[PDB]
Amino acid sequence: VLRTHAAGSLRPADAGQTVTLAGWVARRRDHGGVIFIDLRDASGVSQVVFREGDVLAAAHRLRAEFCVAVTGVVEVRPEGNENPEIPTGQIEVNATELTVLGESAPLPFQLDEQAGEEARLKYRYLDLRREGPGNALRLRSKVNAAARSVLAEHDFVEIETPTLTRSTPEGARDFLVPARLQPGSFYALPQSPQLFKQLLMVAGMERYYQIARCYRDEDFDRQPEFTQLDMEMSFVEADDVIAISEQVLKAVWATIGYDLPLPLPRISYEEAMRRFGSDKPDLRFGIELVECTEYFKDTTFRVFQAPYVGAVVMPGGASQPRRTLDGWQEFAKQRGHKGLAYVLVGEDGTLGGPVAKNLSDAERDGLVAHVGANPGDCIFFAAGPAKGARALLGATRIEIAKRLDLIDPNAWAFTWVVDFPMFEAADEATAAGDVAVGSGAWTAMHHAFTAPKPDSVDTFDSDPGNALSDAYDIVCNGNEIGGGSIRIHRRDIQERVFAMMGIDHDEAQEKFGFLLDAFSYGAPPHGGIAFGWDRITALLAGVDSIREVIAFPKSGGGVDPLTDAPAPITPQQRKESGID
Amino acid sequence: VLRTHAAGSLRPADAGQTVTLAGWVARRRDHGGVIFIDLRDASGVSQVVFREGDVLAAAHRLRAEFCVAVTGVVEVRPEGNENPEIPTGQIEVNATELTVLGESAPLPFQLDEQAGEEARLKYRYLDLRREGPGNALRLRSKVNAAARSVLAEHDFVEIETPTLTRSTPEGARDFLVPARLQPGSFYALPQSPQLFKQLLMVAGMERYYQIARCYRDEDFDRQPEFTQLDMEMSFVEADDVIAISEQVLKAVWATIGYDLPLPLPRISYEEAMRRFGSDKPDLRFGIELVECTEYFPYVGAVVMPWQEFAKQRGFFAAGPAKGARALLGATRIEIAKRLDLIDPNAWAFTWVVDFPMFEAADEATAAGDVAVGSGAWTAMHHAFTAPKPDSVDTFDSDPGNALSDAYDIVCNGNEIGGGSIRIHRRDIQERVFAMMGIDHDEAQEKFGFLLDAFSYGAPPHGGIAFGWDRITALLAGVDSIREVIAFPKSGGGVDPLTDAPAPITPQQRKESGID
Numbered sequence A: 001v002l003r004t005h006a007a008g009s010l011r012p013a014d015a016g017q018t019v020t021l022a023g024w025v026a027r028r029r030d031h032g033g034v035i036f037i038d039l040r041d042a043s044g045v046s047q048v049v050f051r052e053g054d055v056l057a058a059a060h061r062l063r064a065e066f067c068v069a070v071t072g073v074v075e076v077r078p079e080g081n082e083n084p085e086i087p088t089g090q091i092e093v094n095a096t097e098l099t100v101l102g103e104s105a106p107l108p109f110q111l112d113e114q115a116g117e118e119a120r121l122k123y124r125y126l127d128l129r130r131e132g133p134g135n136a137l138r139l140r141s142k143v144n145a146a147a148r149s150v151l152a153e154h155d156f157v158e159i160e161t162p163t164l165t166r167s168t169p170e171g172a173r174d175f176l177v178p179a180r181l182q183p184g185s186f187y188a189l190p191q192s193p194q195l196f197k198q199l200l201m202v203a204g205m206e207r208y209y210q211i212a213r214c215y216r217d218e219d220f221d222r223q224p225e226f227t228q229l230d231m232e233m234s235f236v237e238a239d240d241v242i243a244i245s246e247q248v249l250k251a252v253w254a255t256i257g258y259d260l261p262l263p264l265p266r267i268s269y270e271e272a273m274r275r276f277g278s279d280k281p282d283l284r285f286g287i288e289l290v291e292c293t294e295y296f297k298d299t300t301f302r303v304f305q306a307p308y309v310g311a312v313v314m315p316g317g318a319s320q321p322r323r324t325l326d327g328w329q330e331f332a333k334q335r336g337h338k339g340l341a342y343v344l345v346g347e348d349g350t351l352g353g354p355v356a357k358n359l360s361d362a363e364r365d366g367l368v369a370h371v372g373a374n375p376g377d378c379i380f381f382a383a384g385p386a387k388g389a390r391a392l393l394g395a396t397r398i399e400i401a402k403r404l405d406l407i408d409p410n411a412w413a414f415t416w417v418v419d420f421p422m423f424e425a426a427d428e429a430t431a432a433g434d435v436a437v438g439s440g441a442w443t444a445m446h447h448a449f450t451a452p453k454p455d456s457v458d459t460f461d462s463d464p465g466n467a468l469s470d471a472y473d474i475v476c477n478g479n480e481i482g483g484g485s486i487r488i489h490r491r492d493i494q495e496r497v498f499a500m501m502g503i504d505h506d507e508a509q510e511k512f513g514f515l516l517d518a519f520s521y522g523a524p525p526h527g528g529i530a531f532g533w534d535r536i537t538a539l540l541a542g543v544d545s546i547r548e549v550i551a552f553p554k555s556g557g558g559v560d561p562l563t564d565a566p567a568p569i570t571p572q573q574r575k576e577s578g579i580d
Numbered sequence B: 001v002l003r004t005h006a007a008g009s010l011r012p013a014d015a016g017q018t019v020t021l022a023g024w025v026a027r028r029r030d031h032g033g034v035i036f037i038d039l040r041d042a043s044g045v046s047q048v049v050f051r052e053g054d055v056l057a058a059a060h061r062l063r064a065e066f067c068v069a070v071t072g073v074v075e076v077r078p079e080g081n082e083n084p085e086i087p088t089g090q091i092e093v094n095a096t097e098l099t100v101l102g103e104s105a106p107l108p109f110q111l112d113e114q115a116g117e118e119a120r121l122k123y124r125y126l127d128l129r130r131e132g133p134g135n136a137l138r139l140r141s142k143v144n145a146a147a148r149s150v151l152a153e154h155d156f157v158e159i160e161t162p163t164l165t166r167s168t169p170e171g172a173r174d175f176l177v178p179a180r181l182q183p184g185s186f187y188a189l190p191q192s193p194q195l196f197k198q199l200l201m202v203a204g205m206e207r208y209y210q211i212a213r214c215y216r217d218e219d220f221d222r223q224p225e226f227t228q229l230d231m232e233m234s235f236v237e238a239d240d241v242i243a244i245s246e247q248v249l250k251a252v253w254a255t256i257g258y259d260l261p262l263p264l265p266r267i268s269y270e271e272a273m274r275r276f277g278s279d280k281p282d283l284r285f286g287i288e289l290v291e292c293t294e295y296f297p298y299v300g301a302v303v304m305p306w307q308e309f310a311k312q313r314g315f316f317a318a319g320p321a322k323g324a325r326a327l328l329g330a331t332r333i334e335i336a337k338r339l340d341l342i343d344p345n346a347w348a349f350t351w352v353v354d355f356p357m358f359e360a361a362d363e364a365t366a367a368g369d370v371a372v373g374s375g376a377w378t379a380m381h382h383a384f385t386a387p388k389p390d391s392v393d394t395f396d397s398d399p400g401n402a403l404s405d406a407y408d409i410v411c412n413g414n415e416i417g418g419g420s421i422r423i424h425r426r427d428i429q430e431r432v433f434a435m436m437g438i439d440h441d442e443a444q445e446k447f448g449f450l451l452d453a454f455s456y457g458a459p460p461h462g463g464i465a466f467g468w469d470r471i472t473a474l475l476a477g478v479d480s481i482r483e484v485i486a487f488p489k490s491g492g493g494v495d496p497l498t499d500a501p502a503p504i505t506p507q508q509r510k511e512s513g514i515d
């Protein structure tokens, strides 16, 4: 009998009972001639004491993280050993028998330290004994259940899709698997279940979900395999997918006791880029971008003679020392931008900083009113191509929030971002780490199977820059936590998307024929969404890195300090691989 | 508005209401001047009728498996068009407006035929529209929920384990993944979560489960990837694992309305081989083996209330005990089939316990399996399986007589699960490896992360995994696991749906970091 009672539930009312606990030696301390340990199991901790005889002699072997079974009599602790901070704090187990189920060597790190990432991954099994990490895993399980419960209630069917398949393009490279029985051929682990979930709508399943494993080989806080909550529905429009996504987000945030107000805000891509410099905007604070391109259209200041000029306002920043302002330049350089021009606004409205003297009287006179500044403030400006200037202002805005302590650590600010344009230049995609769908000068903003908005259906291939899509992202605290779209369900439209990314009919049929052929047999309208489940769990847990909510994660570049994967193989094993 | 009401739920009480249905044209027939369809969605079927005007002219385009939205008024059907065989059979929708959401070409097969396996897999998305295959998938989802509900109620934590890892030996070959950033190196897709679930017990998680994906490269009704309900517990003995396994089997069979009596029968390996010729015995019938060794190596008998049969697969069988018993084990089954002795509604379960610890590597290599290493013995269950207490000192030096704390769960002559209490000490585990020819250094290289973990207070632990595809296939009443997998492979890993596996560009191969 290794266990008769859980350690966390003993109380004074249990005095006189004989119990057997099994768990681990959290701490050991010696006072008098006697040995005290805290014995920990999943339900909590009880003090155990070894007072006489052979059990006292045996207790001398005990050290941190020994695994033990102890039988003994529950007792009320003496006056003044009571520990009021723990639920079993009034009692202890006076030990009768002790059995060492497993010894522990001295630890690479004690459980009350946090060690380097490499050590914590290497000894992840010890890390997970610490309260924080272990509760992260317990939470994650609860988060999976909260999602499944809402989905089941709304008649979604859970369906497992293949992982040894053909490639789906989600913007990364594929992980490959050589096929022993077909020398020279490979399976691809899937970047997402996208193609399968679409087929499942053609199959009449109507409402699908999966908590599915996805594989993307990318630049590396990024893991080579990761988890999505993946959903698809038939006969829907975006609102329907949003509405059910909201129910799932509500149930999920309920797991940490936050009541999510519904429905969630929405904002268009254009407007998110305009005001926040980001398609993943952090709305826990203001500090919005203000466009000044038109404002400065007649400037004689070389720097503001540009496609784009924009500003953000730092509350109270005119007081900043010259040192700190030089620091703002470093800030921008460390992100590959020329810098941040600025205007200091005095208490009497007078303008200083280096910019001031380059303005005209008209420009000086209307400026504060134009950017919404106040006496005492600091106006930063970025000028250049619209896309780069906005990202810089988008970053700047965040740094301003940090320095002025404007982000409430308990706040949850969500928004949908909708009305995404349909395409990205392929130049911008290759150099941002992503993989373009093909060799064409355009590629998908979301993915190739994303539908144009009805009004963009005729022109998306002849005027790609203007084309709008029926895609939607869900953002929480400046993180993308999900995205989806209404799909294309016709071959002609889908092939037109592929052709302009340089995939002609024949290649489209070779690489995606099974989907295109399926469109010929009564395909319904459909669409869906996937949530980044690691990211969502990480947020609920209050941690910054998804490594903290994955049981056995990789580090950087796919290094696995726990098992030392990936590893080479024998020449024999390689011959039998059928590779080569 | 594509849909306002489900098609299966209309009834006479809905007469006069305007509804919009969206689904598919199951059937079309024309009589009088009128076009009748059956409109199907997941909830069932309602008849829709097109009687006048523009909607009639448009209904002329409709053919099987067109996908449509139809708005119309619900009506009671005329006397003598009532269809008593379907729940909406008393009513129809008189259509007002019609929209074709997606045309269908002529089908490779109609939904009321069953076609060849290759065609059904090639057009699996059409196959799944047939009642049988689609309900199989709906059931499987329910089966997953029934298992999760019991496990959550008993404080198990669902935990996801890696798939890009190092190899675990479950008796097959590994599927490999080349690592672009480490030229010449590979990940292995996991044969099961075994190593991780043991680490999780060392991590103090105490009760783990996962519905996990497993990858084994074998001979081919066998899929290269498949699903396990995987469980592990700390501070347990076999009975504790069996007890919780039984609760999970009860909740699962309740999904088809069978009340599973508990506890389940148990029988030792020795006795299962003796009486049934099989460690996966079918107990829906008798026809037991009778040993004919003491009617002056092995002679046995079975009684039928045949030569071709024996030849094609390898009264009385005589020879080495293991082969003779398998033949009699097979014979017994053929007897049951020919005399119609198997009640198709019966569920006969049993645990098989007290498994011996090893088998010969000769018997394993020639049965399709892969031995753990170079040694003349290999595991009966897996290398991490504990010897029974009495076998702890001699399993090394008298392997034939060593007994293990493993257990299998069998239903109707299928293994549907298996587990064991594990080893949690390095010396014992290494002694197991050594006799399979894996000495200390190789054991540390290939399994060091587990062995090292045994130095930091490892608890007793054990568990089990169920073959979830096989269990779902049984609940559904089908013989092949292909019928309860959404997009399965056929034979030899052929995938008629997507044509995987496929070759790759020279460019793609260079970037692979392979070569």
Ligand SMILES: N[C@@H](CC(=O)O)C(=O)O
Binding pocket: A170, A191, A192, A193, A194, A231, A447, A483, A484, A485, A528, A529, A530
């Ligand atoms: N397949 C998408 C999700 C979606 O479009 O629903 C992804 O991987 O992000």
Ligand SMILES: N[C@@H](CC(=O)O)C(=O)O
Binding pocket: B170, B191, B192, B193, B194, B231, B382, B418, B419, B420, B463, B464, B465
């Ligand atoms: N890992 C085993 C199951 C177990 O031993 O629990 C299997 O793959 O069958």
